């Protein structure tokens, strides 16, 4: 489910002390926080149940597990759409701040001022959402 | 744990369970394998807690609503039944347990409410809700009433909830739609709000539940129940001479019950499922089985067609099937049980005035349809948002990235999109394969530092002479301060982010453990937080000046000239690329702590001091050493964009700040705690005159009545660094910064515009400052109000 990145075999060489396209498994946790992944001891584990030495191979199989996807913009649109009462494509700041002040992880009332200015790119008190989705995407 | 070699049924406590056990008995003497039958209390809850540590029984019964949940936790083995055995079944109730196009359980009959009536008391049952208060008051003269039913589970509300508009959940694109939930609907909010009215005039009580009700019902203390098929054998067996109908309309529209199909699943942990499919095919599902089952408690409309033939000619069987027409067979999707415990929770608080109507609904719409999720979704998009546009203005503003093969095009449209952070990222990744080539071949000592380094958890440092938290830490990006440039912050332009120094955490030491970054200690008050940001980026100095000082500017001076040798001579460089001085490595937050290990690695690999790398290579090197090492080879620099806001943080206070540091920082709190009296007014306002604070000059001005005496004691001040070496007039026109301050000081005849300097540059006179800074507002200003031009001898 992965390709092109081929995740390192770059960083994987790393920790390939004899060259032999493997690597040990007590080091496997490091190597994947290395590139940006925190699998719990218990997955680790189960993980090093399946096989000690890891080869590449094995090494991206395992990455692509814990791999997350990205939201998609039609799920950015769709979650923007279930707060827009009117339909029209709009959410008021008022109505966006209580949603995301009283809705989800708790976050500071300056970091959703902040989100609300940014999103509302014409000063006029609302979001355009699909556009604003849109022009994220490049 | 399930035991093999007999089955173990759980069924609930309102159904026909001793006839489901005689149907175990023919079982037993058939196979001799004991068929024991249970009803504990709230098994539709006890069942998934058990199952999903693989016990439980081998056979759940419930309505279906509940089993795609249990499907999707994996708690049931899918059903094989042949086509001759399928052919038995009505194929909507093969519909009804059908979960991600398999089968996951059998039907065994279909429950929909009815509106059960004492045809003695109610010879002519009401067609409407509306119609039910007038018949209450009539039956209350003789001290009964009209309508009881069970107010505590929320599928006997339901059917008048769903009458003017309510649903749960909305059919479209070929599936029920998780996130159109219309629970708070205006229809919904009609039914409920009916529902509440009749108990708050006495009509009905909140706190009736399902004994209450049947036990009234079936001693003829009301004249009418909601209830389904399962209850009738009770009103069988009291005296009462009922009747079975379609529930009453409300708003004209029919009562909408969620209809159950009453369904057997298969444990998947169960080691008989062979025999369990033995028994529910040829045993239960049978015209001896389930007229077993039926003639204990009435089941409703089987799905065996054979026998359903004959009971659907009974009126009570056709009401059922006439009210469930009129319903909606339940979801079986994993989110009913939210859902109705949602649905439960309005409605008893609603009933009870512990909530009005609009509230509990509103609260149970939130619940049921998960607007935590659509929330977050949108939250972590909006973060990203201001993250793409710090960084699609650093990468394409600054001059730097346009010297290298780095720099971005000015965003198409009013924003910048993500293609920044993808940016970032391909950066990132640039100067990690670049480092990776340069000490690919890595030794046994080099990768064991490597490993402790990606261990690592990091404290982040942002030191101030200003007040930035209370409760709440905030801190802003440069750019937003002023929103509220020179070409040495062009270079790099990463104005719109917020600067960290960079300390190893795992260590039980005073925080913090180092002061200074690049060796200017940034203030006395230390803002620490201990988790990484993931739209925050590192360089391994300072980015727009990446030289590393000679060791006796560093912090920690000693520590290194007493411990070290030859590296005290080699770390004193600049921290780049293969592109030259100005290529500054830049990594993301997932390769920070690649980046770091490797650069230091290789730094310590060209090093001739081997008692330095002996102690990097310690293999048990403390936390508290290697911060040492690493600000010392580096002085790492985090960036967060745009801004910190958090209630997660720690504050330390490294030191007083002096009220010089605090009139530079603004810092109102400190000022407002020093300037009390007059002298220190004097000492105040001749620094905010130094450092051309204008602004804070004014309000000090405006808290204390200065006069000309007040200006001759500031002259008399050879401890302020300021006044020690300049005139007061001096101070008030060398820059154009303090000209608001000069205004004021003309304005109130607080100075001589023509006073000759006594100190620097003495004889000479404000205008001639005003002219030497080229200030024509200044200058003319001063010409205005009385200024001499030019200077006679004496
Ligand atoms: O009240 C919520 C509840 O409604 C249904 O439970 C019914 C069940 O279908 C009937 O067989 C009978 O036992 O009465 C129950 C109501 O007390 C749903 O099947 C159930 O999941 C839900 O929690
Ligand atoms: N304000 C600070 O502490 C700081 C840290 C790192 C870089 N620049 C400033």
Same mark, same amino acid.
Request: hydrophobic share 40%.
């Given at each position: 489910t992965e390709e092109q990145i081929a995740e390192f075999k770059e960083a994987f060489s790393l920790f390939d002390k004899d060259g032999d396209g493997t690597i040990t498994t007590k080091e496997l946790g490091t190597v994947m926080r290395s590139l940006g992944q925190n699998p719990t001891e218990a997955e680790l584990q189960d993980m090093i149940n399946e096989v000690g030495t890891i080869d590449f191979p094995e090494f991206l199989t395992m990455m692509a597990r814990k791999m997350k996807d990205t939201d998609s913009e039609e799920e950015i649109r769709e979650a923007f759409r279930v707060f827009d009462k009117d339909g029209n494509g709009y959410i008021s700041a008022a109505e966006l701040r209580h949603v995301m002040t009283n809705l989800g992880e708790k976050l500071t009332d300056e970091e959703v001022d902040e989100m609300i200015r940014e999103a509302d790119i014409d000063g006029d008190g609302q979001v355009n959402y699909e556009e604003f989705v849109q022009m994220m995407t490049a | 744990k399930i035991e093999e070699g007999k089955l173990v049924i759980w069924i609930n406590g309102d159904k026909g369970y001793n006839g489901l056990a005689e149907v175990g008995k023919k079982f037993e003497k058939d196979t001799g394998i004991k068929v024991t039958v249970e009803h504990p209390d709230k098994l539709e809850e006890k069942f998934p807690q058990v199952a999903a540590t693989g016990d439980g029984p081998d056979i759940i019964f419930w309505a279906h609503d509940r089993f795609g949940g249990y499907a999707q936790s994996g708690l049931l083995a899918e059903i094989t039944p042949a086509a001759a055995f399928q052919d038995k079944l009505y194929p909507f109730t093969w519909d009804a347990v059908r979960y991600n196009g398999k089968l996951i359980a059998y039907p065994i009959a279909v429950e929909a409410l009815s509106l059960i009536y004492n045809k003695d008391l109610l010879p002519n049952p009401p067609k409407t809700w509306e119609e039910i208060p007038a018949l209450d008051k009539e039956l209350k003269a003789k001290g009964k009433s009209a309508l009881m039913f069970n107010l505590q589970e929320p599928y006997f509300t339901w059917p008048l909830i769903a009458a003017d508009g309510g649903y749960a959940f909305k059919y479209a694109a070929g599936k029920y739609d998780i996130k159109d939930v219309g629970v708070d609907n205006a229809g919904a909010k009609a039914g409920l709000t009916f529902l509440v009215d009749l108990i708050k005039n006495k009509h009905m009580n909140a706190d009736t539940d399902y004994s209450i009700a049947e036990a009234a019902f079936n001693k003829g203390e009301t004249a009418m129940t909601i209830n389904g098929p399962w209850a009738w054998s009770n009103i069988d067996t009291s005296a009462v001479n009922y009747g079975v109908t379609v529930l009453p309309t409300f708003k004209g529209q029919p009562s909408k019950p969620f209809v159950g199909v009453l369904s057997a699943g298969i444990n998947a942990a169960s080691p008989n499922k062979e025999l369990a499919k033995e028994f529910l095919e040829n045993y239960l599902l049978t015209d001896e089985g389930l007229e077993a089952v039926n003639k204990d408690k009435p089941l409703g409309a089987v799905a065996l067609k054979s026998y359903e033939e004959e009971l659907a000619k009974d009126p009570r069987i056709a009401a059922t099937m006439e009210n469930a027409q009129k319903g909606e067979?339940?979801?079986?999707?994993?989110?009913?049980?939210?859902?109705? $415990?949602?649905?439960?929770?309005?409605?008893?608080? *609603? !009933?009870?005035?512990?909530?009005?109507?609009?509230?509990?609904?509103?609260?149970?719409?939130?619940? !049921?349809?998960?607007?935590?999720?659509?929330?977050?979704?949108?939250?972590?998009?909006?973060?990203?948002?201001? *993250?793409?546009?710090? $960084?699609? +203005?650093?990468?394409?503003?600054?001059?730097?990235?346009? /010297?290298?093969?780095? /720099?971005?095009? *000015?965003?198409?449209? !009013?924003? /910048?999109?993500?293609?920044?952070?993808?940016?970032?990222? +391909?950066?990132?990744?640039? $100067?990690?394969?670049?480092?990776?080539?340069?000490?690919?071949?890595?030794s046994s000592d080099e990768r064991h530092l490597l490993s402790i380094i990606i261990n690592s958890n990091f404290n982040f440092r942002h030191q101030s002479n200003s007040n930035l938290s209370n409760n709440i830490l905030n801190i802003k990006s440069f750019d937003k301060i002023q929103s509220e440039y020179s070409e040495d912050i062009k270079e790099i332009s990463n104005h719109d982010f917020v600067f960290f120094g960079v300390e190893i955490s795992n260590h039980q030491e005073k925080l913090p453990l180092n002061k200074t970054h690049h060796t200017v200690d940034f203030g006395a008050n230390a803002y620490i937080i201990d988790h990484d940001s993931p739209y925050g980026y590192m360089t391994?100095?300072?980015?727009?000046?990446?030289?590393?000082?000679?060791?006796?500017?560093?912090?920690?001076q000693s520590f290194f000239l007493d411990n070290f040798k030859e590296v005290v001579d080699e770390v004193s460089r600049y921290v780049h690329g293969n592109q030259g001085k100005t290529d500054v490595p830049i990594f993301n937050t997932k390769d920070m702590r690649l980046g770091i290990g490797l650069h230091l690695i290789d730094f310590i690999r060209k090093s001739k001091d081997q008692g330095f790398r002996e102690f990097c290579y310690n293999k048990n090197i403390d936390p508290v050493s290697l911060d040492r090492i690493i600000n010392f080879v580096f002085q790492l620099e985090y960036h967060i964009?745009?801004?910190? /806001?958090?209630?997660?943080?720690?504050?330390?206070?490294?030191?007083?700040?002096?009220?010089?540091?605090?009139?530079?920082?603004?810092? $109102?709190?400190?000022?407002?705690?020093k300037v009390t009296d007059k002298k220190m007014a004097h000492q105040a306002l001749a620094y905010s005159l130094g450092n051309k604070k204008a602004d804070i000059a004014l309000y000090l001005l405006s808290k204390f009545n200065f006069t000309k005496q007040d200006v001759a004691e500031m002259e008399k001040m050879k401890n302020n660094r300021y006044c020690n070496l300049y005139d007061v007039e001096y101070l008030l026109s060398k820059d154009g910064a303090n000209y608001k301050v000069l205004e004021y000081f003309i304005n109130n005849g607080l100075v001589d515009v023509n006073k000759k300097f006594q100190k620097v540059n003495s004889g000479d006179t404000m205008l001639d400052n005003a002219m030497k800074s080229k200030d024509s507002k200044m200058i003319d200003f001063l010409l205005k109000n009385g200024a001499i031009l030019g200077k006679r001898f004496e």
């Open positions: - | 067979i339940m979801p079986n999707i994993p989110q009913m049980s939210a859902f109705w $415990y949602a649905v439960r929770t309005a409605v008893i608080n *609603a !009933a009870s005035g512990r909530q009005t109507v609009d509230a509990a609904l509103a609260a149970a719409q939130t619940n !049921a349809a998960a607007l935590d999720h659509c929330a977050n979704t949108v939250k972590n998009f909006l973060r990203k948002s201001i *993250a793409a546009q710090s $960084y699609s +203005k650093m990468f394409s503003q600054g001059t730097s990235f346009k /010297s290298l093969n780095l /720099s971005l095009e *000015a965003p198409s449209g !009013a924003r /910048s999109s993500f293609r920044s952070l993808e940016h970032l990222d +391909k950066v990132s990744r640039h $100067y990690i394969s670049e480092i990776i080539q340069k000490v690919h071949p890595l391994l100095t300072d980015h727009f000046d990446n030289a590393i000082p000679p060791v006796f500017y560093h912090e920690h964009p745009r801004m910190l /806001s958090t209630d997660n943080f720690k504050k330390i206070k490294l030191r007083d700040i002096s009220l010089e540091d605090a009139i530079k920082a603004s810092n $109102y709190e400190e000022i407002n705690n």
